[PDB]
Amino acid sequence: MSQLAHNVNLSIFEPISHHRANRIVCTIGPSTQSVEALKGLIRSGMSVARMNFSHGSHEYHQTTINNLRAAATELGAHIGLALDTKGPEIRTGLFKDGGIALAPGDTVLVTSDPAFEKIGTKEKFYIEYPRLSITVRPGGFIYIDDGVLSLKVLSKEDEYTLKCYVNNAHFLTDRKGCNLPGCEVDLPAVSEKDREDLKFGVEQGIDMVFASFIRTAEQVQEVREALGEKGKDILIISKIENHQGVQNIDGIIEASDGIMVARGDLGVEIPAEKVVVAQMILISKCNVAGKPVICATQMLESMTTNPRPTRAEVSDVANAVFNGADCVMLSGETAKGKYPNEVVQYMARICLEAQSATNQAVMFNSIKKMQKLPMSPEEAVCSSAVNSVYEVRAKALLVLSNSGRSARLASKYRPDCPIICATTRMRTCRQLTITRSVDAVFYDAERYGEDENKEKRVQLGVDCAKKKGYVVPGDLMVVVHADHPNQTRIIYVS
Amino acid sequence: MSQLAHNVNLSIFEPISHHRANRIVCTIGPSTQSVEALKGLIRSGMSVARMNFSHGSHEYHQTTINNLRAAATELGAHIGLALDTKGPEIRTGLFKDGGIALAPGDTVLVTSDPAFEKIGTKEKFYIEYPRLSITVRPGGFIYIDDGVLSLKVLSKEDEYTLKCYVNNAHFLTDRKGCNLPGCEVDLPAVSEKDREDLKFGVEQGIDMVFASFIRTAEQVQEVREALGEKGKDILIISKIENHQGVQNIDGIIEASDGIMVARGDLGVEIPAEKVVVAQMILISKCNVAGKPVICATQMLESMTTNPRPTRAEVSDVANAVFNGADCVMLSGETAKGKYPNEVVQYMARICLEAQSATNQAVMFNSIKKMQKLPMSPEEAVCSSAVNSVYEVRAKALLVLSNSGRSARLASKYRPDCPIICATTRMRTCRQLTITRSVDAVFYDAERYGEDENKEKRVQLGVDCAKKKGYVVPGDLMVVVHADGYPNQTRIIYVS
Amino acid sequence: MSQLAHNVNLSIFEPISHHRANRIVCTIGPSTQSVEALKGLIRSGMSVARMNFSHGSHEYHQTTINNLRAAATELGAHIGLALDTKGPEIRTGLFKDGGIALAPGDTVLVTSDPAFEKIGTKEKFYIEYPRLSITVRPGGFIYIDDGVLSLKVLSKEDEYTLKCYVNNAHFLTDRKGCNLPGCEVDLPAVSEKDREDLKFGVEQGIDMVFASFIRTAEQVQEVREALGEKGKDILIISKIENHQGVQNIDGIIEASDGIMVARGDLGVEIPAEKVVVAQMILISKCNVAGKPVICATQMLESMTTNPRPTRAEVSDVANAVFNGADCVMLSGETAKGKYPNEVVQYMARICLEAQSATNQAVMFNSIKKMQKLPMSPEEAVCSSAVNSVYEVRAKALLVLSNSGRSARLASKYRPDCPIICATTRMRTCRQLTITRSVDAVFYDAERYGEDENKEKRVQLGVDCAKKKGYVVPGDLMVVVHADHPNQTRIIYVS
Amino acid sequence: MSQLAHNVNLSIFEPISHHRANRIVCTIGPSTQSVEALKGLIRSGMSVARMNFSHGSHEYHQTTINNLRAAATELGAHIGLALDTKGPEIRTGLFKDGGIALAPGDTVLVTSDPAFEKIGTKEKFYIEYPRLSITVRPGGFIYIDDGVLSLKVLSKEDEYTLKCYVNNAHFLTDRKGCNLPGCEVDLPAVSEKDREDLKFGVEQGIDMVFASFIRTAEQVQEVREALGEKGKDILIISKIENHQGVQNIDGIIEASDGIMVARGDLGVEIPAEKVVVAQMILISKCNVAGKPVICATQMLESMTTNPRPTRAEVSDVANAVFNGADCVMLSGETAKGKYPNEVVQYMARICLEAQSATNQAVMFNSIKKMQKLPMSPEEAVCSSAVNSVYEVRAKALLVLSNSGRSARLASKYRPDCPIICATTRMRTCRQLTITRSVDAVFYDAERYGEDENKEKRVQLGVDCAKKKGYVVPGDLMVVVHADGYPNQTRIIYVS
Ligand SMILES: [K+]
Ligand SMILES: [K+]
Ligand SMILES: [K+]
Ligand SMILES: [K+]
């Protein structure tokens, strides 16, 4: 049938019997750094904790790491740990008396001539960007101090200098970050700080990396190389933040393990109505690729200080889910907000509402129709297992995958039931936290043996399903595992 | 194909070749009531002018009507004229000292006893709604003042009086609005002031009524009765504002000419996530029925006073279009905002982006898969005509329908091209302003003759698509007409 | 649904309510040359009369023509008139005493050296084919005297001469036709006799030509050129008789107006099981092209002298219909048989049985799915009209087409009801007799006017439908016609 | 895709890469009863040996059985052994002077009175069938002597005697066979000589019975009863020979293990064009049920005495395959013809041509579209396995089924590759010889162990596909088995 037919037969006041398939990423901040606070978040619905490396030293983040692992252990929970890189930046230079006041209607010259690095004035100051006047055009814009100060470029004065118009009052201070909307800029894939930070990330055993400002496939390869051999199993989620990213998404997807749609960042460069559509394209492309996609920024912002969001905000979360996002991310709302638990709980409810209003069969059919023939054995087995779920109406799907690969492959086909992955690696448990539908369960092969005939992982998988209330004796499950991940079975729960 | 495959093959940076199918309803007020501002709105992309009859007297609205018809005639435009009723209303009485401070954990007595109307205290105050004790039960909820004050009903004290638990802190002032979530509210379809508004409306030859707070099919019938014989051709668009209304959607739709999803009102009573889903359900049911649906309230609100809306707002509007809405409505943004024209231009842009990002073929198939076999001739002819537009890539669809019925029927099937409707009735032109994809063109039979063989109306329609830039010579159009209902199609080269 | 589902729900003893869509071509001979005989055939179910120009002079065929037109007129029937060309031949030379006896196991030399033209013996004789020993190989075969004498080529003796093995007793006589199975032979598209015959055909106003031995697209173009300007509206049906024909069918179809599958001819060269499959391919290709295809030879042969055929023969007729043939052709059975009327009647019954056992919706969907998008207006209109028939369950489809074009286009989409074509040309009436489903009705514009608003042709079309018992008042028809063939209507019969 | 699109893209001159899926049943007789000739037949492509029990004594058939098992063991082949019963029989009595000449327009009295058995005249003769006057009514028909003499019943003269109209000239001789078209014929399922044949059959461990002249489900049950406890695993294949049988096809199918379409017998009673359609209907119903169907009689008849058949005959055989038949049967062509081996080789060739010209995917879809949702596990597993063969292009499908049930279930879904069945039962090997696509391979559990984890049977099956030339290392196979019914699939690389 169809989404159209799903909508018209929907009873919006009947209870939802579905279980939450989407996953929530939370930013850790002052509101939420303690063991207790982190437990609250875990109980509320957090799957992944995001360290924002734009702020805070290594020891700040070490605290997040330690307290998160203490909390997760207490609760018997696998939580993903994500390092979100600062990324390259363009900074202003210095000012006399450490700052300057600008007024709506003033002109100010901005220059890449270093002679002005140390000596900025209301009238002229330095931006650390050698190709400034090859890059930014007249009528173009520059934003400074997290997008707060807006300058309209009036004209090119010389090869180092632009004349600008001040659109709003701001008091500008030493070495602020700059925005150059609409420009191919000459910045590296990773900064030197990024390099130190990724190194730290690898030493601390992070699960995934949110790579800032990704513009090309090669830049992703640079993050891969940075992480090096020792971090070859850390996932890279490339953050798409601008027109180049959106333009290069096919290659970036190929190179990455996943994508983050940074809506607010995109919205600096691109008309809002085109960010909406970019979000759709980017999400659909990841679905088709079977790679996790995370929707970030501008999510339930107003809930940072209010106990309830606007409907518009709620609708925007819903729609990311409808779009096909695995995950939705919270920023300030958990990092520094008044209601971190409540907002996470509320996200969970919204997700669940939208899940229930989606016809999953339609997306399954849609992904399926993208598949070229012949398929590889591994695609065939996973898409065939999902097809079996719909056909016999199974209430859970169990995959035995040590790396998580098949869990991701299954998920990509959008079964209308939960996916359980029995794995021998805790790392796989933490990394599956960004994959829709999935509950990872850890099989301890050191304790219980190698389980060559699978009997013990199947049984663990089934017990997990029973204990979360997905199945009871008499229900059907589909099980995917290796022979002596290419075997499927259809079983009754006993 | 599929929406998914449409998405992955989409380039957001290519120019858009499509022509806007969705329609914009604007509320007139002080920002936009002058002839000159109305011409601005029309040029900016208004199809329907909304007279909000909560506010303003008849004289004030007469100025709207006179100015609108002066403005529309100058620009040769057909503009829908809509009366939006005040409707029934639950308000509190007065408080001593002008208001009262209610803290959570407080209990308060609310009474429908007229003797307390003017002496509300922290202890006890008046609510105008006599069947209060009957329709709100213990465990039921009362929301006051745009839904910000929440009261749980603990018990009935007498027939006049309920004891309520205060859930949350709020300062409550003279005559604020009350809502009764979940309840069957026992107010009339039309207030007494609504009958006088309707009366004025029919006198002035309005095109449609936006009927407030519609909860049942029978209430739609009461609005139908109130317009009476004289007003029999005026479209009724039922406003769905609460739980009962959402629940009774099938009946209300069948009785109405179309639906308006009143999100702000819905959101007072219903949790926000269920408004999102409710909207989807309502729109999709209207889609199936081939009746216009209008998404209203909380659209681009911040743009009332700011030059820019938020991305979330823009997203909200776009998604109304994705859901399948024919129209989107502006309220304060045009009625009193600083950027009337700019907001309308911006809505048009959003609409057109979302249109371009939609796989129309998928909605065509979805609608078509729902028709029973065999089809009636008219249903086969209209769906066949829309299928032809896709198969030969025609660039407009021309429909000859004096009442507008076939144009609505063609728009149901979602062709990805414009729909021209040749009609002999001005009223139909104005009534079609709420139907997705349609541009009505008037055939003046008094000047050009009865056109028994349709040839003149067919040429008029082709000329219309030429003037508007939809087709040039060598393009294809698809034509639908009678030889009753439409029973013929043509496929033609534009000359 | 499907043919599979159609079969299982079929009630084989319930009456058939369908009307005969397939058409029957009859060969005219001694059994059937009189006015009376020809009337019998017309009443029995003949749509097309075939003159076989392999035998009989011009005056012989003039008699067929005259008597057929006399008969058709009496009965108020439009019958197609088809000239089937002799084609090029390879003849032997002469023999002393005008013949020679050969025995199973004898050797005989065959030569293209003309010195032997006049002087053939049991031991050596002439075949009029200069490239003989470049063409026929050892182990290859030659057949002489309508395929009766079989010679196996033992060896090449020199450049003019082959040594052969005699497989069967035959008494071989002056100037018999030869078969060279498995060979690209060097023969013209038309013979000089063919040229005279086509000329005669054009003077006598034939409707169509069955072009013998068509091997390439250019050869069809040669028949087109032969017929010339004066015969530019005569249809060419290319007869496929060998491997080259089957190999070149795409181009031959493109160039032709239709195809005849000459099964017996093909079966000389090609294994029987491959003729079965050739028949399928050739028929399907014509369907997809919207061009008539006729199944010929070896149809109900045994009914030439017996009052009933074998089941195998019956099944073979049925299957041509199932395959998708517009038409099935009778040869000796009507040309020289004992039961010309009965065999034609029996063909009609078989056709009708098979029609009723076919799921036409499946072929409609199948043709439809071949169509590239965009379609032209004319394809769109016809395929849309047929789609309407299924959708509102119309009981007839009426096209107004003076040339018959739209009738052929409609037919190609396989409606499950009869097609009526109102046309201003009697020639169109006669030519539509090879197109499945179609009843042509003649509108006399000289008598009744030009009917610019179509009212009179619609009314004539509807009356035709009523009078054949296809519709009654209250039924639906679909009508396709031109504006001021691009208008469709759906009407109720009054 | 579609059969149509498969046709137009087909090249008849390309070599065929497929392996024969259809099976050939051969009747043994004097041409082929020797060990040496049976080895010829096996090498030529016989899967099933048919003992025709209309003719020959037990000793004669014992020689068949002994020779067949000598021949099959030498070549290491599994050959189905089938008993085809004589069945009940309506014959005339004797005539004075050895026969009578009946001219059309003559009337004749036919009687079931035993006193006329030996004295038939032009006026009156005997037919052995006591309920004649009851089951043939005025207007009903009696066919005699392979259906060539047609009699219309005019009236019942007494309880013994019918007055008949002669439709057509014929010379009628001692004890010719009679048919009663349209009638419910009141003969037993099994004659007395049939019980002795069956008895012999079960003693000798035959694989299947071809049960003659089956008209009702209850008659199938009688054949089931006659094989009794000892013969409970012998397949019953019901022969459909007349109108009642065709009419009762749903019941007969449900009661049987499969069906044989007896065309010659059908054609005596039913007009030839309806036999063609009847065959389609029967085959398609067997297809849907997943039970084997065998097309028999009038196959390549002229090849009994000629080196070549006619194209029409070849066409007939090919179309049995297109219709969806699992098997085709040879009669006189092998039993007494001059070219036993050549006819079988030729059938194999025809079968394989027709196989190659079929779009198997279309039959897969057709079958699959008929399953109810939700499916049972076994149905989901088997259809899913066949789907995998198409999706990854596997080159054989391996099924572990001791009874053969899943192999039959897999063959229902029409994979376009061979099906290997690993079974622990020799009987299953022989029984699978009538199932489209299947090669059974025997797992000797006594020698190799019980194979609880299936690994040995999986390797055996892979080896079997290697020996047979279906796969090489690097190809894919699909595997089905239990962990009851089949509930697991694998997809594997051949090593
Ligand atoms: K960051
Ligand atoms: K209002
Ligand atoms: K000829
Ligand atoms: K027998």
Author numbering:
A (entry chain A), C (entry chain A): 1 to 484, 490 to 499
B (entry chain B), D (entry chain B): 1 to 483, 488 to 499
Task: Give verbatim lines from the article.
Here, the first apoenzyme and R-state structures for T. cruzi PYK (TcPYK) are presented, thereby providing a detailed structural and enzymatic comparison for each of the ‘TriTryp’ family members. In the T-state structure of TcPYK (apo-TcPYK), the effector loop (Ala482-Gly488) is disordered in the absence of F26BP binding. Intensity data were collected at the Diamond synchrotron radiation facility in Oxfordshire, UK on beamline I04 (TcPYK) or I03 (TcPYK-F26BP-OX-Mg) to a resolution of 2.50 Å (TcPYK), or 2.80 Å(TcPYK-F26BP-OX-Mg). A superposition of the T- and R-state tetramers shows that the T- to R-state transition involves a rigid body rotation of subunits (excluding B-domains; AC cores), whereby the subunits pivot 8° around a region (residues 430–433) located at the base of the αβ barrel of domain A. In the absence of F26BP, the S0.5 values for PEP were 1.23 mM and 1.03 mM for TcPYK and TbPYK, respectively, both exhibiting positive cooperativity (h>1) and similar specificity constants (kcat/S0.5 values of 137 and 141 s−1 mM−1, respectively). Addition of the effector molecule (F26BP) to apo-TcPYK or apo-TbPYK increased the melting temperature by 2 K and 8 K, respectively.
Pyruvate kinase (PYK, EC 2.7.1.40) catalyses the final step in glycolysis, namely the transfer of a phospho group from phosphoenolpyruvate (PEP) to ADP to form pyruvate and ATP. PYK exists primarily as a homotetramer with subunits of 50–60 kDa (depending on species), each of which is composed of four domains: the N-terminal (not present in bacteria), A-, B- and C-domains. The active site is nestled between the A- and B-domains and is located approximately 39 Å from the effector site which is located in the C-domain. Trypanosomatid PYKs are allosterically activated by micromolar concentrations of fructose 2,6-bisphosphate (F26BP), instead of F16BP which is effective only at millimolar concentrations.
